Design a binder for these strands. Structure first.
Ligand SMILES: [Mg+2]
Ligand SMILES: [Mg+2]
Ligand SMILES: [Mg+2]
Length: 533
DNA sequence: GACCACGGCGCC
DNA sequence: AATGGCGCCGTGGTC
């Protein structure tokens, strides 16, 4: 429909582009086009044409920006219809879906993608007419965040490859020791990576008791939860659990990651997906750097591989109990607020009449369990305690936090009536199953509905913090590298590391004052692990 | 080679 | 913390 016109397009044009593969740091830019004023302009030479653009404006704008940055061009992402649609309804996660829903078709041609971006923007922008709070999120959070994310993705993080290569060889030997032992105990070799073959050995051959079933197909489960309950029923179980941890870590982190170092940067580059979750959280992929191990000994060895550039240091910042602090704000519960106001540690309170680092991490679990409606039975089982004691603290927990219960009840009722729930800033998630006539389904929905305002507000705060923090770091010559939901990892020159850490901490803590203070813990170090002071 | 569903599990 | 939110592994299957 659009009149074909020579490259370049006029300022403000919407861009379309085709990548050889989804990851922009690795993609070949196959085609580039732009649409505006009833015309479409197709670039004869996509790479060179990139220099003609003032900004990347259109579907998946950030992806193009990342590729431009990769090529040394400071091309910032602007409007992206995906972000508008994601704010309207976070189930809007793909261009295929968004195009279908809001006025077009996602094809494989740059020109059509440019045209599509233009008309989708017009339509979506119109749908936002009147949605003042979603507009504010778009302008103050999502749109500027996309530029920040573009820089993070293009910067990447340094990884000690030789170290991981050496580690792989060690872990391989330990795994061989484990599988050889398991096979002896089974009385025959099988594929130990097959949970189906494992199922038969444990429950049919060795005749161990099958405890639970798998969700979709009803097989006898061999999950860690089950194996843990059998650890003293046969010596093969512990060996299997150790085999699981080692192969999990080797196959997911140790072996793959070193092979993903980019030839130009010498660094590892993730993608931070901005329209991928139902709550407003970011996600990370290709590879996921938001689930790097940290809990077990080997897991910590893996995390140590993430290092600062020579002459620089990593600065790691974490919000402390951001979700509970958020819950205190949203519910307005006086006591829970008094808890954070008076700089006390809540999990401690409960831990005493329940200081050990285990008698606390057990008090945290319970606190969150009752929070999510865990009954006196369902919780007394999961945790080594009688049903009585379960129902016991359940009643008091809410006796002392009455407004938390009332907030949950109010949130669900409104969710049922409106069809959606919302964060502090008005980000929405639609949850229709709050009215289902099947209890298990309805109650699953209720746990999602109630979680979203809390997890989503925490996400809103972190995103806003990232938006505020980025320009300050640029001025100081520091970089933002990673976000892990309630954590940030920065890279700073050694001489400036301490100042950067102080500043970033203050920016994060004061991003948007609540009824309770936000607290941030900060560490500095040569690697991701050591940086967690 | 690709895709899928699944069970399973890494992080927040 | 993992109840909630994700992404990736190998297996088993298909195309
Ligand atoms: Mg933490
Ligand atoms: Mg799954
Ligand atoms: Mg296969």
């Amino acid at each position: 429909a659009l009149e074909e016109a020579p490259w370049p397009p006029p300022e403000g044009a919407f861009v379309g582009f085709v990548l050889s593969r989804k990851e922009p740091m690795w993609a070949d830019l196959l085609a580039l086009a732009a649409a505006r004023g009833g015309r479409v302009h197709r670039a004869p030479e996509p790479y060179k044409a990139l220099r003609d653009l003032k900004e990347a404006r259109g579907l998946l704008a950030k992806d193009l920006s990342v590729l431009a940055l990769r090529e040394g061009l400071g091309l910032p992402p602007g409007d992206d219809p995906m972000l508008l649609a994601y704010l309207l309804d976070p189930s809007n996660t793909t261009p295929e879906g968004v195009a279908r829903r809001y006025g077009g078709e996602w094809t494989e041609e740059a020109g059509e993608r440019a045209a599509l971006s233009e008309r989708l923007f017009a339509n979506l922008w119109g749908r936002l007419e009147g949605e003042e709070r979603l507009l504010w999120l778009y302008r103050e959070v999502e749109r500027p965040l996309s530029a920040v994310l573009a820089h993070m993705e293009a910067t990447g993080v340094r990884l000690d490859v030789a170290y991981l290569r050496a580690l792989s060889l060690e872990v391989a030997e330990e795994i061989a020791r484990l599988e050889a032992e398991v096979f002896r105990l089974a009385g025959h070799p099988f594929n130990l990576n097959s949970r189906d073959q494992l199922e038969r050995v444990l429950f049919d051959e060795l005749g161990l008791p099958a405890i639970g079933k798998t969700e979709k197909t009803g097989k006898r489960s061999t999950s860690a939860a089950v194996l843990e309950a059998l650890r003293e029923a046969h010596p093969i179980v512990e060996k299997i659990l150790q085999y699981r941890e080692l192969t999990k870590l080797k196959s997911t982190y140790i072996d793959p990651l070193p092979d993903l170092i980019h030839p130009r940067t010498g660094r590892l580059h993730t993608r931070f997906n901005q329209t991928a979750t139902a709550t407003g959280r970011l996600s990370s992929s290709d590879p996921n750097l938001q689930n790097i191990p940290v809990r077990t000994p080997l897991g910590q060895r893996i995390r140590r591989a993430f290092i600062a550039e020579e002459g620089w240091l990593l600065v790691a910042l974490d919000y402390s109990q951001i979700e509970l602090r958020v819950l205190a704000h949203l519910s307005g519960d006086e006591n829970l607020i008094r808890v954070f106001q008076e700089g006390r540690d809540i999990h401690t309170e409960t831990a005493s009449w329940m200081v050990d680092p285990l008698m606390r991490r057990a008090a945290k679990t319970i606190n969150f369990g009752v929070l999510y409606g865990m009954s006196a039975h369902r919780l007394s089982q999961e945790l080594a305690i009688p049903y009585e004691e379960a129902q016991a603290f359940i009643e008091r927990y809410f006796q002392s936090f009455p407004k938390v219960r009332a907030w949950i009840e109010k949130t669900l009722e409104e969710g049922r009536r409106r069809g959606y729930v919302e964060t502090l800033f008005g980000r929405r998630r639609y949850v229709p199953d709050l009215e289902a006539r099947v209890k298990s389904v309805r109650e699953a929905a209720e746990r999602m509905a109630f979680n979203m305002p809390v997890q989503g507000t925490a996400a809103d705060l972190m995103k806003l913090a990232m938006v505020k923090l980025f320009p300050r770091l640029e001025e100081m010559g520091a970089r933002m590298l990673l976000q892990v939901h309630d954590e940030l990892v920065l890279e700073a020159p050694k001489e400036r590391a301490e100042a950067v850490a102080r500043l970033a901490k203050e920016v994060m803590e004061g991003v948007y004052p609540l009824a309770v203070p936000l607290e941030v813990e900060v560490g500095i170090g040569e690697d991701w692990l050591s940086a967690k002071e």
